[PDB]
Amino acid sequence: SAQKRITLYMASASPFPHRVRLALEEAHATYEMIHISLVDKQDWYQKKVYPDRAQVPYLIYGGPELHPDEAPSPDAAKIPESLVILEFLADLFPAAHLLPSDPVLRARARLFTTAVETELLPAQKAFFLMGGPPDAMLAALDALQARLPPAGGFAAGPQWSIADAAVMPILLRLRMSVTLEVGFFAPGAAPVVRAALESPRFARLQRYIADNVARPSMAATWDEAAVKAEFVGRFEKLRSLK
Amino acid sequence: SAQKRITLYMASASPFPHRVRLALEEAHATYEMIHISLVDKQDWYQKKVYPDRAQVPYLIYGGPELHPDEAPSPDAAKIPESLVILEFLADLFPAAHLLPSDPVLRARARLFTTAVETELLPAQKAFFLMGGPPDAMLAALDALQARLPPAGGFAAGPQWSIADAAVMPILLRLRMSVTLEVGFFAPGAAPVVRAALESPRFARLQRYIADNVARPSMAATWDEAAVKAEFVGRFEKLRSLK
Ligand SMILES: N[C@@H](CCC(=O)N[C@@H](CS)C(=O)NCC(=O)O)C(=O)O
């Protein structure tokens, strides 16, 4: 009946491991983390841990204590894909209500997550990686904001859910990128987005971000210095290979 | 009941409504269907039913009886997005076991579905809509086949699940398209894939298709003459608009 072992392979720059950390903290799970860098991928993580894709996040469920440069027990479950890991944690910790009980509100959470993955993330890539115009990024943020309940609350309604885990790491890193002006932005594009995100246009979205940041799971999982250092480091690597 | 009435806006040519129909039948659900043409779409669909996107499937849950050319009640729930609808039906009908009970096995089903949506469907689009080469389509089919349990059974294990509902409509339409050569295929590309699908390389996938077709839910959801008529009609219309 006691929880089986959880080990999470992660990193800081990407939004995807942060999603999982938020859900683990909201579940009050016991877990250990292992940071994966490119050297780890090349030297042992692809070989001993995750041969098919060597990506993070990657959750190991069951088995004995796990350290870097070690293969997981063949008897443990290995789960990739941040969104699937979120649904897994909601199934594993039912008393935490990481998804709501009502089936329509569960559908609402999943519709919100679908839109994050299929609409917001492509828009962020077009803006940050491909130097697209700020108006298209702000239109995607308008659409995201309109999917939040206008009467208040979290993405699926009054209660926090894995839908909030899915989007909050992206919003925090988007704000960081446009505030530090770190990215492959069209000229002047970052300030346009930064200023709009602080304006009355985005009052609802600002309230939503604040509501999520005020929860204990955010302080437990957001280390601004570490995220910045790896985010900027990744950008400088991208810039240099080019 | 008025609390639990299901009305499904659907069509025949697209795989997406079929996915939903498979799960409804596996759950032995009671439901009504409204047919939206994918050749000459009824203007009342966008105007009265689904103004934002006017896509099928669209599931209406609760409220009074609903007929064509009528707006759903404001008090009924409206659920788009086939993969979300499948998860919704698994939540509504727990006794049908549309997903397995164990969290790890539920993750297995969800990983299979994610690969359908993010790997197989993009490959089909590149091949059928954009005239891409047949080896890229075969690579995606090889990868799908390798995700199946080798000894037999369904996508997530011995029992049927919504992972099977996600993929089987695509496989049936792919086979039909390459067999009739109805699509925007490169010269020579359709026969390469048609022959491969019938060859020993794809024996495991053939057995999979046959095991799904043998279930009663297939005859209750797959009218190949109606699918083909709308599929060909839509293709010929699209081609004529260049
Ligand atoms: N992600 C959606 C995709 C739905 C979709 O693409 N529907 C198309 C099938 S052609 C549609 O309804 N199109 C309306 C139109 O083309 O006018 C799902 O899985 O339900």
Numbering used by the authors:
A (entry chain B), B (entry chain A): 2 to 243
How is this structure described in the published paper?
To further explore this issue, we have conducted biochemical and crystallographic studies on the interactions of six GSTOs from T. versicolor with chemical libraries. The six TvGSTOs (named TvGSTO1S to TvGSTO6S) used in this study are representatives of the twelve TvGSTOs that have a catalytic serine, while four others have a cysteine instead. The ability of TvGSTOs to bind polyphenols through different sites suggests that fungal GSTs could be involved in the transport of various polyphenols.
The crystal structure of TvGSTO6S was solved at 1.45 Å resolution. While G-sites are made of similar polar residues, differences are observed at the H-site and at the interface between monomers. However, when compared with the equivalent region of TvGSTO3S, significant differences are readily apparent in TvGSTO6S. There are also slight differences between the dimer-interfaces of both isoforms. Its interface residues form a pocket centered on the two-fold axis of the dimer (rectangular section of 8 × 6 Å2), larger than the equivalent region found in TvGSTO3S (rectangular section of 7 × 4 Å2).
